[PDB]
Design brief:
The structure is cut from a larger assembly and holds chains A (about 525 residues) and B (about 500 residues). Chain A is of the alpha/beta class and about 525 residues long. Chain A has 17 helices and 14 strands. In chain A, the strands form five sheets. Chain A has a four-stranded mixed β-sheet. In chain A, helix 2 crosses helix 3 and helix 4 crosses helix 5. Chain A is elongated, with a radius of gyration of 30 Å. Chain B starts with a helix and ends with a strand. The chains are: A alpha/beta (about 525), B mainly alpha (about 500). Chain B: Its main location: cytoplasm. Chain B: One of its GO terms (biological process) is positive regulation of protein localization to Cajal body. Chain B: It catalyses: ATP + H2O = ADP + phosphate + H(+). Chain B: It is an enzyme of class 3 (hydrolase).
Chain lengths: ~525, ~500
């Protein structure tokens, strides 16, 4: 209790910080996690693993609330807020051991926290369009683990970033916003990976029809079907009459001609290209060609529900009205620019060009392996997280680790002209800032004390800017950490991620220094 | 709460002490592991899958050693003994020299470049095998049946296993990658004898149909696979209550057979004499077919009817109201139900979508069946890797010492920090060349020396160590061979384990 519980606060949180220092960044490591008597999970992104683990101390308990407070709001900086607060605990304790009030340090901790976010306010950039987020080619290049995907490391990253970044695509059921949602990019192999190309519109793997049905329709009305075909079942209800036993076979084939009426009523509201999730027989393709329609069968529901949200109005991929094959009543139609059949991967597939109600964009990736499909998944998860940070945070911050050394430079002058005890509190808050280049180089298996000493050595004055890398602070690397320009190999950061984690760290640190009791019945 | 080098060394001490007794279990000449139960029970095996499941492990890294053995078992089933041997000395030799210097990420990327250099060296050492010659396939199976040292009638089961797997080579992923063995089916027979049997076309069934419920014999008529809707109509076209009343008996039963006879007329269009029905099968539906002169079959699991659909190469219809010869029963087809023992065994030959032939074995007992089967079980592993990769790598230390040198000049070329894990993996490859010298009984320091000397001249192309004679032998002359694919995935699993436990520095609760 007293100092001992404030010791027990530090000693618990330091051990928790040791877990997530060994899990930070892509060079972080996976940790064995006992959660049951026979279940051990092995992961990183350490805010996720604290949810996996169970708490031991109330000191351990309060910080699992804090990282989840970061993690509910955003996915970035979630494991980082744990490390910063534990650095505050060792810095303030020596001062409390020296002479200092616990009240006095947390003031200059929060005052520097007000001062640091005002550095973030002056370290903003909104031009993140041609500069990109993390050096447009390097937005995927550090995330494309260069196995057979680094040989197109500037080829792929020029394509997959520009296709998502600020150009058109529709969100969920047609919401006005640039791409923040998952896209209709497909992964399939064949003949090369240098042939992976951008397409204007939608990628759909589908089973095309061939008995004289139209192969290319411009200005098409799209019917996205959720309901299958290849017969509608009926044994009585049409033709009750009996003259011969041949007429008994005439009864149960009247399930054919009742579908013939309902297809033209589907065509009457709006239809040019029929996309059916279920299969369509060639006898059931005959219902569409005598009305006049482009029926493509066995459509993948995953891409089609991306189209049914894009195509506009009330669509059959959202309808629950079913008659075996239901008929339209009023205003059930989806929209498109044009439907052009293409030769892609040397496979004749229906390449749906842009829907009306927010025209779109996607990529058909080509590979040589099923392993090419696997690696471009994580080369799709990376760019979508890059672009989502751009579209909601247009104003971003250049540098994420370059800022940490310069904030320490920004605060030592802010410490110096402050006056009293607060000066030493601003400086020890800056000592907590240095751990971010420190945990990365250990994770990157490099020297921490060398690399952070390189950072501060690049300086003219205390401002991170993309001017120059030899006489100003700019950027970092997730595998090197050397300060680099933010178009070649440096780093950006959204402004929203840092201002929460810096606020959350002092928010944890204030309540920990309140703790001077272990009273119990 | 565990951290630091102590987790790392505990990862070393656990993964090493597993591979110690199991490398003595390696080789066709081996050393059995003894397991004393606390009840006094004795286990005397070499197969690590029976070993790892039986032993009690307390370190979850040792539990992860079972998991990467479950990885190799579910993909192959063989080499699970060998994947844990290589992964020990990767983390035994390199780690403590370098984690006192503490660079985890560099040894990961060193483990990356140890993998692909082995891949190109596999293409250097492996000459292609003939997938169109039985005798090119024969000696590699003969290298596998002598591991258990059973060649009573496994030698004739060599040709039975290769004429199954080479025949069932059909598997697509967009570029036709074939690694299938589930399309093949063994015959489990108490009667008859092995030698006067042979492989038959299609996929032969022994799992549920053991009776002549189909016909006695079939020359012309087709097989019908029914997942279609055969549930009868209770009302006029309605689903009312079923027959439980005399008043429900007179009205409904006229429409019960009425749904069935429409389906039966659709099936007689292709003229079968056999119809098997699996989904939607009713008791009335399969006995109006008895009145429609077709003996009908149910109570069969779905994996049978994937084989039966591959026994004829046809698509199982989901359309009830129209069936064709191009839907079920592709081509003419053949169905043969004959007496082997006392039970009448259904064979379905004449598979259109050709090249489909499966295993017909028959022991004089089930025990006589089962002992030859395990050798043919290992034999169908090998030919599946022949279908996966048609190049054969020499066994023994010919493959290992050749790759162990190529890392060294790679270490001299790259000469960064990663040069030190290359020579460590280069010694980690040699443990199976090491353990064969105990599997024979010779001086291990001289034989490892001369195997380096044969790399100086012959490059160890086919001159590796034998744990049978204790000398460095021509693998061409002695016929010790295996495909490249089983060598790669064994090494690929050991790379995965070494990267895995290198990430493990903390084990917490």
């Amino acid at each position: 209790t007293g100092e001992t519980i404030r010791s027990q606060n530090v000693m618990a949180a330091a051990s928790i910080a040791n877990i997530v220092k060994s899990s930070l960044g892509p060079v972080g490591l996976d940790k064995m996690l006992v959660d049951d008597i026979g279940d051990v999970t092995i992961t990183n992104d350490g805010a996720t693993i604290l949810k996996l683990l169970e708490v031991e101390h109330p000191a351990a308990k309060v910080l699992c609330e804090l990282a989840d407070l970061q993690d509910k709001e955003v996915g970035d900086g979630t494991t980082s807020v744990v490390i910063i607060a534990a650095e505050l605990l060792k810095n303030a304790d020596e001062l409390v051991k020296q002479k200092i009030h616990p009240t006095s340090v947390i003031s200059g901790y929060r005052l520097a926290c007000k001062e640091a976010v005002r550095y973030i306010n002056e370290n903003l950039i909104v031009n993140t369009d041609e500069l990109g987020r993390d050096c447009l080619i390097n937005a995927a290049k550090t995330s494309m683990s260069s196995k057979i995907i680094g040989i197109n490391g500037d080829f792929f990253a020029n394509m997959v970033v520009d296709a998502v970044l600020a150009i058109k695509y529709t969100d969920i059921r047609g919401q006005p916003r640039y791409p923040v949602n998952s896209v209709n990019i497909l992964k399939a192999h064949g003949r090369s990976q240098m042939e992976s190309m951008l397409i204007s519109g939608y990628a759909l793997n589908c089973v095309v029809g061939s008995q004289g049905m139209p192969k290319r329709i411009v200005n098409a009305k799209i019917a996205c079907l959720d309901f299958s075909l290849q017969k509608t079942k009926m044994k009585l209800g049409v033709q009750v009459v009996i003259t011969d036993p041949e007429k008994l076979d005439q009864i149960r084939q009247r399930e054919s001609d009742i579908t013939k009426e309902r297809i033209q009523k589907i065509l009457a509201t709006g239809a040019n290209v029929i996309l059916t999730t279920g299969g369509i027989d060639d006898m059931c393709l005959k219902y569409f060609v005598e009305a006049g329609a482009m029926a493509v069968r066995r459509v993948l529901k995953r891409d089609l529900k991306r189209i049914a949200k894009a195509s506009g109005a009330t669509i059959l991929s959202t309808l629950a009205n079913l008659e075996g094959e239901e008929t339209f009543e009023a205003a059930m139609l989806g929209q498109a620019e044009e439907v052009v059949q293409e030769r892609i991967c040397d496979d004749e597939l229906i390449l749906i060009k842009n829907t009306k109600a927010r025209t779109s964009a996607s990529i058909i990736l080509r590979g040589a392996n099923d392993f090419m499909c696997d690696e471009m998944e994580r080369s799709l998860h990376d760019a979508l997280c890059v672009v989502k940070r751009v579209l909601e945070s247009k104003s971003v911050v250049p540098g994420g680790g370059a800022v940490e050394a310069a904030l320490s430079i920004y605060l030592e002058n802010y410490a110096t002209s402050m006056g009293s005890r607060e000066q030493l509190a601003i400086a020890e808050f800056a000592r907590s800032l240095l751990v971010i280049p420190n945990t990365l180089a250990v994770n990157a298996a490099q020297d921490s004390t060398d690399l952070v000493a390189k950072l501060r050595a690049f300086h003219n004055e205390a401002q991170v800017n993309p001017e120059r890398k030899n006489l100003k602070w700019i950027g970092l690397d997730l595998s090197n950490g050397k300060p680099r320009d933010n178009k070649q190999a440096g780093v950006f950061e959204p402004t929203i991620v840092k201002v929460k984690s810096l606020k959350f760290a002092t928010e944890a640190a204030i309540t920990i220094l309140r703790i001077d009791d272990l009273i119990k019945l | 709460r565990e951290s630091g080098r102590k987790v790392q060394s505990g990862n070393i001490n656990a993964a090493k002490t597993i591979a110690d007794i199991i490398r003595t279990c390696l080789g066709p000449k081996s050393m059995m592991k003894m397991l004393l139960d606390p009840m006094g029970g004795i286990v005397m095996t070499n197969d690590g899958n029976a070993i790892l499941r039986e032993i009690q492990v307390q370190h979850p890294a040792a539990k992860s050693m079972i998991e990467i053995s479950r990885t190799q078992d579910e993909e192959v089933g063989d080499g699970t003994t060998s994947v844990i041997i290589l992964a020990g000395e990767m983390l035994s030799v390199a780690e403590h020299f370098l984690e006192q210097q503490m660079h985890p990420t560099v040894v990961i990327s060193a483990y990356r470049k140890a993998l692909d250099d082995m891949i190109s060296t596999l293409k250097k050492i492996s000459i292609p095998v003939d997938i169109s010659d039985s005798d090119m396939m024969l000696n590699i199976i003969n290298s596998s049946i002598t591991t258990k040292a059973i060649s009573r009638w496994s030698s004739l089961a060599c040709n039975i296993a290769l004429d199954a797997v080479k025949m069932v080579q059909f598997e697509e992923n967009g570029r036709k990658e074939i690694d299938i063995k589930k399309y093949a089916r063994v015959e489990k027979i108490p009667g008859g004898i092995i030698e006067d049997s042979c492989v038959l076309r299609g996929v032969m069934i022994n799992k549920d149909v053991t009776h002549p419920r189909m016909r006695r014999y079939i020359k012309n008529p087709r097989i019908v696979l029914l997942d279609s809707s055969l549930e009868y109509k209770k009302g006029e076209s309605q689903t009312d209550i079923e027959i439980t009343r005399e008043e429900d008996f007179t009205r409904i039963l006229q429409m019960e057979e009425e749904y069935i006879q429409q389906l039966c007329e659709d099936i007689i269009q292709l003229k079968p004499d056999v119809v098997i029905t699996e989904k939607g099968i009713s008791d009335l539906a399969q006995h109006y077919l008895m009145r429609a002169n077709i003996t009908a079959i149910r109570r069969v699991r779905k994996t049978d009817n994937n084989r039966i659909a591959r026994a004829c190469g046809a698509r199982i219809v989901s359309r009830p109201e129209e069936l064709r010869e191009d839907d079920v029963g592709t081509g003419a087809g053949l169905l043969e139900i004959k007496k082997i023992g006392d039970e009448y065994f259904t064979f379905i030959t004449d598979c259109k979508d050709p090249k489909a032939c499966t295993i017909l074995l028959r022991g004089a007992s089930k025990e006589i069946l089962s002992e030859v089967e395990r050798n043919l079980q290992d034999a169908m592993q090998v030919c599946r890797n022949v279908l996966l990769d048609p190049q054969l790598v020499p066994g023994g230390g010919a493959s290992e010492m050749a790759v162990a040198h190529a890392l060294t000049e790679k270490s001299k070329a790259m000469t960064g920090v990663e040069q030190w894990p290359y020579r460590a993996v280069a010694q980690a490859l040699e443990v199976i060349p090491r353990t064969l010298i105990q599997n024979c009984g010779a001086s291990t320091i001289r034989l490892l020396t001369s195997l380096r000397a044969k790399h100086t001249q012959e490059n160890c192309e086919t001159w590796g160590v034998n744990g049978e004679t204790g000398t460095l032998v021509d693998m061409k002359e002695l016929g010790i061979w295996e495909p490249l694919a089983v060598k790669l995935q064994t090494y690929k699993t050991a790379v995965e384990t070494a990267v895995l436990l290198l990430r493990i520095d903390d084990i917490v609760s």
